[PDB]
A and B are shown apart, each in its own frame.
Chain A
């Protein structure tokens, strides 16, 4: 969390730089981090799965 050139994510294993949306911008990673299926049941709750 909060590492890399894009203020999102950085995977230390082979240098994957991701942005705050989870998208690949630098490094060897082929695709964007997976967005799980989710929905908000109210203003305070989120149900992922």
Chain B
């Protein structure tokens, strides 16, 4: 709640800015490494998010190509960073582990 939470939060906000994907207009979940669980979750995204996600990634690849970056104004502010993919991925993991528990019996 107090100084303590803000400190961790500000340590997190610091790394975020240092990680620097926001400079390419990206979002945390856009940088997630695609594995089986991730592929399925990407698959389950509804039309809108999936479309936005592809354009974001395209904007970035395009930048990373000419090794430019976005104007400061358009970086993605921490806070404002939507974990759109998270709930889907969590459910995909939660599903797999169920098969995995079933496979032990």
Quick check: do A and B touch in the complex, using CB within 8 A? Answer: no
Q: Which residues of B contact A (CB under 8 A)?
A: none
Q: Which residues of A contact B (CB under 8 A)?
A: none
